[PDB]
Amino acid sequence: FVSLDSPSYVLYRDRAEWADIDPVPQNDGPNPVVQIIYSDKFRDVYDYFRAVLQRDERSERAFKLTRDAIELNAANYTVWHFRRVLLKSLQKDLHEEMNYITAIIEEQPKNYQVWHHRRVLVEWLRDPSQELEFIADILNQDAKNYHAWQHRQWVIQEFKLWDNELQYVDQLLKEDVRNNSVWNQRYFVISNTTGYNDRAVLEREVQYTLEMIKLVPHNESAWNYLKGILQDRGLSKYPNLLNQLLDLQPSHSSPYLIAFLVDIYEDMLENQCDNKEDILNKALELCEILAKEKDTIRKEYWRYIGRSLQSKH
Amino acid sequence: PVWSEPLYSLRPEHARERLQDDSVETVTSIEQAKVEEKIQEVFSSYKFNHLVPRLVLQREKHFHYLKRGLRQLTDAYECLDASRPWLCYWILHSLELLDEPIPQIVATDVCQFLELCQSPEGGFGGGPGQYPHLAPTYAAVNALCIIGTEEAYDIINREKLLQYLYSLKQPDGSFLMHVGGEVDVRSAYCAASVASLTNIITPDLFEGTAEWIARCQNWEGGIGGVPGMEAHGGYTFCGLAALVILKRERSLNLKSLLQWVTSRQMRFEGGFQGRCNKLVDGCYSFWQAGLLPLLHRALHAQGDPALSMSHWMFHQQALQEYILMCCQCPAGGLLDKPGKSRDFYHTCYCLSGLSIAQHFGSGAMLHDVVLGVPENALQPTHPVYNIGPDKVIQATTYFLQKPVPGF
Ligand SMILES: N#Cc1ccc2cc1Oc1ccc3cccc(c3c1)N1CC[C@@H](NCc3cncn3C2)C1=O
Ligand SMILES: CC(C)=CCC/C(C)=C/CC/C(C)=C/COP(=O)(O)OP(=O)(O)O
Ligand SMILES: OC[C@H]1O[C@@](CO)(O[C@H]2O[C@H](CO)[C@@H](O)[C@H](O)[C@H]2O)[C@@H](O)[C@@H]1O
Ligand SMILES: [Zn+2]
């Protein structure tokens, strides 16, 4: 009907259709703390929200009131819960509510309540037809919105919409190969579809990642993904990777490559590798290089790794 | 000389820690470079050639800002009308860290207010009359424990609190944040924190929880909000702290977690980012750096012979430099990064993180590294609960004398 900023907006205490119910003031006690000096409009809406809540009035007027309460503070989970109780009791059109939550999230995308409300609606409707496109629009504004990605994973997994997500991942990595949220989605998609046990898939992923690394040597996300898809089996289980990284050291070096070498040596020593002494010495030299020159911010960590290696091998 | 203290961030070699974008620009590198340029300007403002004055924590300014916020706030805080117990906690904990006494009157007033926020169904809501929610419940309990008086302790309706937690427990081990609410690792931590402090943990309350949390650790080594999601310092702190309380840390791959969190400290800024390839932020001084004392304890419990007996596994000095030089608002209060406005949340976590960076403690070993003037030394904070260790002991001791509700 009328928004909080509309020129014809009227305070609830002045609305004739609300005269039959007394507003319920918030009781902060005689000597309040962290007391918020609310604007007149804010207090007005909440004095009436408190009245309808206390009265558990499942009405259309109460339903419209929650919209104003939400605009005043979209983080008020109590209002959101009551609004959902009303959607149910009043048998409100859920597609209309979806259009509402769509506009709300667009305005305030970094908020837990709005995304949960949308999930509940999708669950009630069992209709995910608008999700991937809507989420894509949110991500087009902030490619790393955590709630957006989380909601995306839920929808995809709950309604089995895996078919085009890898293509989506590839497009976003093209726009920003440093987007860690996208590399995460990549792992999410592959592990839940083909899995990484298929050696053809793993090879494709390793090649893809190595190519991204050559293009942007200092992008940590690609390095982390490379380790991520090989760590469970053990980095030392991939002998060719060590050689390839070794050849790049002189040129495409970096603390990421050096650290990866240490991770490989660590696993090698853990698996009774040949030339144990030689590997240990190489690993310790690299730990020192990292701690003293190439990754000094992590000196304590690298010193610890050096000592751990000696205590174990 | 005592009047000059060399800084890690001011070393000439530190310039080599600047971002190398490989000549490939993306939104990520552009934003990172912008932050670094601003931070370098700030760093340089504390250096006068070979003269480097000791850094100063503006205690008095922070105190006055905090003292004022504890009583009243402008309508600018209407956005936090559903998180008032958080304001109480952030402010009280900051004052506690600054070793600023809490007047008896103020203490009793806070108690009365939190009592008004407590729901008859158990737990606390964001304000009087609001439904209970695990976030403000966690904050309310921490605030009451910081006050630490029998009056504060007894405000908590333990019988209803346990029933409330039961009402949020899911069969897969997770917890809802509130009735009909969302689920993510924050709930497990909020529940474990309040339940352990108030001694209301039952054998079945956290059945399956440790396993659910472990499922949240991902390929990165860190922990995400729910299984499958990106590792974030916030959810990682919640996950590990909850597991420590449950004595199930071993359910995680501590090696990948350790490597992940240490990688979150920014080589140039000195502070921590919340997730890979995102920006440095003062509040992660706690969420991220706080994971190191937790990891230290976990590894120490397993008999790790390589653990340090004097330092946490992150650059303690660099973090203190970032906080002291880049996160203090001249008018009092702390913040995310230069250019951002102060708020109680960042004031609480920047200070919490500074305290962790200043104090190392393991077994009988204690080693302090207080950068700047000695007055910068803050009171210690417990890595699990983030309230004074003295407050944790006093509260747990008090509640341990009470039975678990309905056994
Ligand atoms: N739960 C949660 C959570 C989600 C996101 C962040 C930090 C978070 O930690 C917390 C914990 C408890 C909180 C209680 C009331 C308001 C909060 C909280 C943020 N927000 C939301 C806006 C915000 N600001 C965001 C912010 C500032 N620094 C990091 N963040 C990210 C801020 O204070
Ligand atoms: C007890 C309790 C409630 C703990 C909360 C822990 C915590 C800090 C969680 C953060 C989760 C999150 C959604 C971050 C993304 O925000 P962002 O994108 O704004 O931040 P970013 O850019 O730093 O990742
Ligand atoms: O950090 C990796 C570490 O996490 C565990 C859970 O403790 O598994 C996570 O990471 C795997 C990829 O390495 C995923 O397959 C799994 O789904 C995710 O939970 C450990 O098994 C692993 O060592
Ligand atoms: Zn922050």
Short mmCIF file of C-alpha atoms in Angstrom, two decimals, chain B residues 7-17 40 47 268:
data_model
loop_
_atom_site.label_atom_id
_atom_site.label_comp_id
_atom_site.label_asym_id
_atom_site.label_seq_id
_atom_site.Cartn_x
_atom_site.Cartn_y
_atom_site.Cartn_z
CA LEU B 7 58.91 -2.24 13.17
CA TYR B 8 58.56 -5.29 10.93
CA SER B 9 56.22 -3.40 8.60
CA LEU B 10 58.77 -0.60 8.23
CA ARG B 11 61.75 -2.76 7.23
CA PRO B 12 63.05 -1.95 3.73
CA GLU B 13 62.52 -5.55 2.59
CA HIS B 14 58.85 -5.25 3.53
CA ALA B 15 58.22 -3.41 0.25
CA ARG B 16 58.85 -6.72 -1.53
CA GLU B 17 55.72 -8.09 0.12
CA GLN B 40 51.70 1.75 2.97
CA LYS B 47 58.44 6.27 10.46
CA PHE B 268 52.00 -6.96 3.52
#
